[PDB]
């Protein structure tokens, strides 16, 4: 199988929040099989960042997601050739994101090229103040729309004072390779945790579970 049981990460992300530029890089590691992937995120331009790190941490690969037999697995059958996603993230006071990854498999390596841009955040909001915790656990529903792969999750970030902060993103996913089979409706919980950071996040460890289901 191209996807072995423990493969490495590679990343750069590029993006521009309210204007803010930035570049990032990730190196990490994973467990494809397990659906369990950590990484070391370091901000190389643009630190300290003046919005919550928060609302990049899911644009930082549905390869590393646990399938049952009984899910079609469109991620790991896009390999070795590799599969693209974009995503929109809208959160309830009108911020708005578009973020892409371009992934790739060299060896043992997922290489991710992605891509991050927000607007419309207001200057007086959790994000542009950093007021937020992280992301609650959710559930990703896949489906097929106009033939594409489609995710779509209604989650929110717990903020500081027992506050939530709504926020729902439709992902798009594409393999490289012409004919991978789409798959079947289905469910993929998540789960996405900082497990440490420093002052300003210029650098932060990121874990991710997830685990695909049929709601039984």
């Given at each position: 199988?191209?996807?072995?049981?423990?493969?490495?990460?590679?990343?750069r992300m590029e993006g521009n929040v309210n204007g803010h530029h930035f570049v990032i890089d990730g190196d990490g590691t994973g467990k494809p099989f397990e659906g369990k992937q950590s990484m070391d995120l370091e901000v190389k331009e643009g630190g300290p960042l003046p919005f919550?790190?928060?609302?990049?941490?899911t644009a930082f690969n549905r390869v590393f997601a646990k399938y049952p037999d009984n899910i079609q697995d469109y991620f790991k059958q896009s390999f070795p050739?590799?599969?693209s996603?974009?995503?929109?993230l809208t959160f309830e006071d009108g911020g708005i994101c578009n973020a892409r990854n371009?992934?790739?498999?060299?060896?043992?390596?997922?290489?991710?090229?992605?891509?991050?841009?927000?607007?419309?955040?207001?200057?007086?909001?959790?994000?542009?103040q950093k007021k937020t915790l992280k992301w609650e656990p959710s559930t990703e529903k896949m489906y097929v729309r106009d033939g594409v792969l489609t995710g779509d999750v209604e989650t929110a970030l717990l903020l500081e004072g027992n506050a939530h902060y709504r926020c729902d993103f439709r992902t798009t996913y594409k393999a490289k390779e012409k004919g991978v089979k789409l798959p079947g409706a289905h469910f993929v919980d998540h789960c996405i945790e900082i497990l440490s950071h420093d002052k300003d996040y210029n650098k932060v460890k990121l874990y991710e579970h997830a685990?695909?289901?049929s709601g039984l």
């Open positions: 199988s191209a996807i072995k049981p423990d493969m490495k990460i590679k990343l919550a790190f928060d609302i990049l941490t050739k590799g599969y996603w974009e995503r929109s371009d992934i790739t498999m060299e060896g043992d390596t997922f290489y991710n090229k992605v891509r991050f841009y927000g607007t419309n955040f207001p200057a007086n909001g959790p994000v542009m685990v695909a289901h």
